[PDB]
Design a protein around this ligand. Sequence first.
Ligand code: FES
Ligand code: FES
Ligand code: FES
Ligand SMILES: [Fe+3]
Ligand SMILES: [Fe+3]
Ligand SMILES: [Fe+3]
Lengths: 447, 447, 447, 193, 193, 193
Amino acid sequence: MNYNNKILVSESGLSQKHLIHGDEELFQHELKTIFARNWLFLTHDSLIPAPGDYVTAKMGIDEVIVSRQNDGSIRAFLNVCRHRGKTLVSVEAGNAKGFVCSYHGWGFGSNGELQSVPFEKDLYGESLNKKCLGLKEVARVESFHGFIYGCFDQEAPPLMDYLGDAAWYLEPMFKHSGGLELVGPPGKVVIKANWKAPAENFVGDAYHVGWTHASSLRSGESIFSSLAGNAALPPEGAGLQMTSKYGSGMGVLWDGYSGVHSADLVPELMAFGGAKQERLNKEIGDVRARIYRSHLNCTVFPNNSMLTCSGVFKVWNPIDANTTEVWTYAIVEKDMPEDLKRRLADSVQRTFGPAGFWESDDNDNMETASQNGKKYQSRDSDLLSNLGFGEDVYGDAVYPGVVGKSAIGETSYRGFYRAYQAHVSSSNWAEFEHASSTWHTELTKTT
Amino acid sequence: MNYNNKILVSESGLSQKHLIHGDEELFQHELKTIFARNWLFLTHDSLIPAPGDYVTAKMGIDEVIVSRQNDGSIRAFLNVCRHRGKTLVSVEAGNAKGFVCSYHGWGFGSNGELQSVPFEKDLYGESLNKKCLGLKEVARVESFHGFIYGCFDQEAPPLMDYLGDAAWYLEPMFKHSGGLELVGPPGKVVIKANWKAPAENFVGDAYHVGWTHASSLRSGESIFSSLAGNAALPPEGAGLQMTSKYGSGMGVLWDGYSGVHSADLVPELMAFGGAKQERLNKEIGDVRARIYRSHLNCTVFPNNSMLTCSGVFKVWNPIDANTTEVWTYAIVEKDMPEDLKRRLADSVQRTFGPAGFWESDDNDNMETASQNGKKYQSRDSDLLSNLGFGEDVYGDAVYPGVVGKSAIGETSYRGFYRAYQAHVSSSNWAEFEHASSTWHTELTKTT
Amino acid sequence: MNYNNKILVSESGLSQKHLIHGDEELFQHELKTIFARNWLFLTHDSLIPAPGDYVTAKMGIDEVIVSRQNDGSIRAFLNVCRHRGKTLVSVEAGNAKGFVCSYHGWGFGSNGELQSVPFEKDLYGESLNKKCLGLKEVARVESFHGFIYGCFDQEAPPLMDYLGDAAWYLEPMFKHSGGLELVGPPGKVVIKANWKAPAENFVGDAYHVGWTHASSLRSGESIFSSLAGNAALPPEGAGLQMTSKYGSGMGVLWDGYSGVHSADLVPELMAFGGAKQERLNKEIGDVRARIYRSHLNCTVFPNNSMLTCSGVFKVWNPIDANTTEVWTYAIVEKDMPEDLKRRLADSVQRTFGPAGFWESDDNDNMETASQNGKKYQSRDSDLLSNLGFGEDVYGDAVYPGVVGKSAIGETSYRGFYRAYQAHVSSSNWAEFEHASSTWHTELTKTT
Amino acid sequence: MINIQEDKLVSAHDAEEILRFFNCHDSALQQEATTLLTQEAHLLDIQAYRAWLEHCVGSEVQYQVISRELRAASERRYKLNEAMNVYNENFQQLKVRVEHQLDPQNWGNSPKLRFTRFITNVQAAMDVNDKELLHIRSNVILHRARRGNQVDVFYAAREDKWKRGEGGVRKLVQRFVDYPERILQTHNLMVFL
Amino acid sequence: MINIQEDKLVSAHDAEEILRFFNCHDSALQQEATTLLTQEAHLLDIQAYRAWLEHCVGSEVQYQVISRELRAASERRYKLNEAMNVYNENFQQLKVRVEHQLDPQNWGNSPKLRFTRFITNVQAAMDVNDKELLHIRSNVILHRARRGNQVDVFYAAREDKWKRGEGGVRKLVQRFVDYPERILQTHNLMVFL
Amino acid sequence: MINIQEDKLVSAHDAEEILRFFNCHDSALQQEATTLLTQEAHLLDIQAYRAWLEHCVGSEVQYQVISRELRAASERRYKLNEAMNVYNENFQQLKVRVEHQLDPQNWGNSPKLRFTRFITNVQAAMDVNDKELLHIRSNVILHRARRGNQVDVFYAAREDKWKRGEGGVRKLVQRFVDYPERILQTHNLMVFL
Ligand code: FES
Ligand code: FES
Ligand code: FES
Ligand SMILES: [Fe+3]
Ligand SMILES: [Fe+3]
Ligand SMILES: [Fe+3]
């Protein structure tokens, strides 16, 4: 398949070829043009706060060691020994000043430098140039209010610019709330689905909530209980959808601070968020303060997703076209009381973790939609994302980005897939930029 | 591999390259040139007799919903939602006027039409053209005396013509007996073999019976018991072999109405079939009436097989080059007494079902012959099907088709593989026809 | 990938691309250019000593029957029936004058000839040319002091020449000791590693011993106990490394006759080997007699490895790029007392067999180094084998081959990978010879 | 103890069966049943099929294993055959299968198969009317290994009826298994559960 | 009986637990516990979730399953959360999950799932202080089959506490499971271990 | 009870073993054996290897696991070694393996492994001549999880001999396992069955 010419996503992101969820050759091509080129979630400051603290993380199918340096910075390295290629670290987290390879004993520092080689003088004499034998390093590592992302491509935009118009929406919760923390360790489960399936569902799919999660809504008595079985349609102005130049996007559901949490947490949360919203009114204004206590279902392109307020934080780690490793963390506001923090963490896993009764509603949707992408008669079929097309705007006085002034629609799919086509048909960042010079015009065409 | 030039089957179907049972690229090419182009078994009227009755079925690796319409006709659709591609129906059979997708709630009718979309007016307004969003439909669905076959290719021959010369042989049992019924549900088992292995074995392999099934013959006391261990060779004129232009073919074993069934059923069956054979003598003649009570091991090209009289009905569903999903049903004569019907059904599964002691004799044969097709030194080796070559005739006064007037031979392999080469080197039906203009001359060459 | 141009191994075998341990296309290409072209271990005379004795063995991914003929010779055949390609023999060893296929009953002799075909006269008449229907035969089968190797390529060098300079090192133990025997049956385990990983480790990796096997050394009280945790560096002149034109090579550790065996065997072994070394001094000289009682870690290109003295004998059978079937036998000196023979066999399996506590130390090393070869960021990385480069010699007065006069180094890796590049970029034996006309100059470049 | 109008996922049959065991508060019968099943599994595991027939199986036995068609939880109109019989054997039919297993020309039995069976969760209760009839419920994990690298594992619940016939030996008179995997991924179901 | 300074791979917790069972040399309690667990597994296997709640689960229950982060054997400085809760439920939370299972719009439950549970290695000992509190240890293999060809098998050790509340019925008051597979290869862990 | 001339698939050894258990109609011994094995499995599962050695294993132990070569059912001429020893250990050899497991530089043991063992089908019978010698048969399913996504499951039948030595503690004096899978698909067989 010629990825320069093949139309995998139609104009304005209206449709995608079903094969994108199933084709292994395209998966291989994504490793290069999506995962090696874009920003990927690694960890949070709260997970490696002290010098020598490290976690392992996936970046595409590659595994990296993410380590807090003595100077307080964070560096990330391929989890691979520079001698004969053994995996260096076999744990998920810990603290250390270095890492020793259990094959031949080479010793690497937390800064990736080759520090020691057993009996170096007697074996290598002076021949070994250690300065050139440090761990392969991740070129770019940047932070967004404590959230750490990595990128293998030096030519990428800074993380902030990469977030584009989505940044404005996240800031109230990520910045103005006084800061978030990530509660680990994460739940880890393998699903038989393409990474794009859950990515697209979290980026702009409020339409499925009432029906897919009918049973969970009915059972939990969460603030969205009505909506179960599509019994009620959310009111006019219940929220909006936005998307952005580099693919990130989100749905906004006004005031839903208790989110997916069951009646046992709703009073406390709704009280906590409201109290903060009052204080924030003076600092960032009413609209932005409201956004803070509003439920955001967002995907940070390409494979990091979250539900603010619900506090669900997800990494969709790619294995192959129909295999994904799901990592689930809980996000909490630092100034929440500890007991509330612990209960929120448990509730996040209770709903969306390995045994999450909500996440289970989604399994078959994701797996079969992905698996059907390999079926002969379906490879060339068109997946539809045209809901709300021709009513999106750009450059609004209040809400930035390409915006659909409605709670339910497919705006965020369109922006997600627009950035995806551009990347897959591009050899580098400059070409993606050229392919994206009229992005917002493309998304609002008929408006 | 250039499938236009590659000789996968030698002239006259004398030999096949062992790689056909193992090559994944060829498997992929078969999806297009065998499974998407030819007639495939779906179900039987007796399985969906009432309006709204449906079953799911495989057509290649695709899954379809096969539904009885209100007007009494049958239509079949891809089991895939037209929105984001989720699998629509998750059961094997039932009754309903429509199907609702559990992802976003789109409602399809049993006629495949998009009937309802949740909150269509508020979300899509008038923009959604539902008439264009019905389930992808199987172009051709036809019946052969209650047996329902589907074909994705509109240019195909009608089913009757597709059956060609094999139709004459099947008619006495399928038509003149007063009709057959299919007893479900079927047994379903995955074997590690290429779909062609069991297809070729059922189409023309009486040679393996005495030896492969030695233990089953000895143990069951069926009408073919002698023959166990190749202890006896069937008498001169014990039967024949036939094949046809579009690949279907069968072996005929004179008078074996009790077939593989154990002594407990032989008296009743042999009495039942004889009684009917007497009545049929006046209606269709002695020869044809005999064919009725004669054991036919047949394959309807490409992957549907059966043993009449024994009542074994098989679908060899393809998964990959060394993986096949075997479906086993029982076929019974409608006018048989119910108690006989139930006992025959059990005996079919007892012998050839998931725990069928006869079918188990075949497992290793099929699996290793298929698996050896991937082995380096064997890919380019030639599988032989030359037994009886140069003694087949065409245009006989009594027995139509390309015919080997002998119970044991490889005539049916030759015709099967002749049609297979023609299809794989052809881009469409017109080219297959051109490649088949001297088919019978090719098969009888040296006669 | 163009294997004519792609540099998979740098000049002088200094580095290899990590992808060689992970690429499936390269694996497929190795089937042709490594496994179908080179000498592969089949069995030992002691395993099939009597006429009609046979074993099955792998040659690449192909399976062959290896049978002792009446005239005392050994012939080997593809374990595949010449009719429809079923696997002929389903056991690992036995005795028989022929083999009958359980599909249709064709009978083959131990000499591979098609001897009988059921009811041949009545079915085939005279048409079947049996002389042309014998089992596909392995072209070359040769012996090295009872050890039997096979080669599919007729153009190969005789086994002795193939062993090249490594032969001299093996002769004292394989020839002058009065002969070795192979104790079966072998242990059989599947590891998730590329066949080259254990092949390279056994051919020249003494560097990993102190560190990888720290726990085993400490626990067993074997003659190399000191060395555990790299606590001590072996003395100057503790041994050497050699490699050869066709890829075979080995490490030599002076006097280590008790090898990996635990204190319970050290006294007896050290006594037994010394006694023989005294007798051999007069026959083959002091140096060669010492080599006999010295520990050799050797790989016979491409995938047969051994530790003399320890008595470990391994076949690394390829399945796919990250899957290998490990066969483990014990080698013993024929003139050892039986009770010592039995205890040595048990100790070989105790240390290096399926539950071998030493072999287990190596598992993760092999599996991850192989698995990392598939990871995107690591495919194009360079595995290093430059230790001791520029100090190897060729044409030494005492020790033949390309030789590193040091116990620990990477000489044998270099020669192994030099022969591997040459084969993979070559279409036949003549081209490999041309690509190897300055092999030893290439390996000693900077010396 | 179950109300199936409230416990909506529970079949009437299943509710019937669990009532029969919550009230046979009877330890010795439980141990007898355990012994019976362990001995049956052992004979089966060593492939002593004739012994099994002679010592464990009653002349009036019904040995049944079904594969149930996957239908909608809410299905109420479609009434055609819900299941097929993988096994549905009388003593004679079992004898045929045993002969088929013992026959020297059963090529699939060379080299010899390896079976290993694990019987757990044993419950026992006497029948209300036939005082000589014992109901026994147990679960089985059956492991079959053959030809180097073929490995199949089967899982199931067994509903048995055992009766003392003659010799006082308690023998199997009915075994019923609703096999839990609709599509077998084990080559065949040719084993005695 | 364990010295953890010598048995270096043994956790203090594990050593504590094994001490509690090497000295409840008490056969009848073992049989009672066996019965309790077999009945619990049976009700679960037939999906009688309301019955399970009413008859097997105490109002003060803590139903907990954790996934422990993989750390170095020699780790001693890193002290952040070692584990997350796959389950950590009180009676009400369990009731919500049960309702979620029974709901007619749980699309994942059609067609009906098939569960088969195997309970083994049962040990029982009374608590030292609360004479009404029974400690029960057991291992479970849980087999789930759905949708033709989906098959998931779960393995775990269970540390339980059971108490007679009212009706004299012994009910579950605490279940603790440290799930042994860090990354689940089973789609989800949505089953009651 | 078996006639091996008629039950053609049955080995003489297997027939010998089953005779020894059809006549130790002895419930208390069965329960003692059950307890012994469950405690042994528990200590093993928590990796208390020194405890296992001290409390469960006799000084005269032979701990043996074999892998039998696949031969023709009708084989009668080929008489070379039929099997190899995956394990064939005396007490000292077991101690070495235990030390190897406990060693801080066993890199394969970090992060810590997770074992879960299921023991079923327990049968017990005293030996005819040595009244202090107990024969115990049981089947084991052994589950090993490591490094996130590595999962190996082992299945086997165990033929044991246990003797009261000193302290009156019954200890293991012989374990014999004929491993049923010829080619292991589990990376290694480095576990104590
Ligand atoms: S592979 Fe890491 S030290 Fe050699
Ligand atoms: S995928 Fe079917 S309604 Fe959306
Ligand atoms: S395949 Fe061997 S006789 Fe036919
Ligand atoms: Fe959802
Ligand atoms: Fe057959
Ligand atoms: Fe090693």
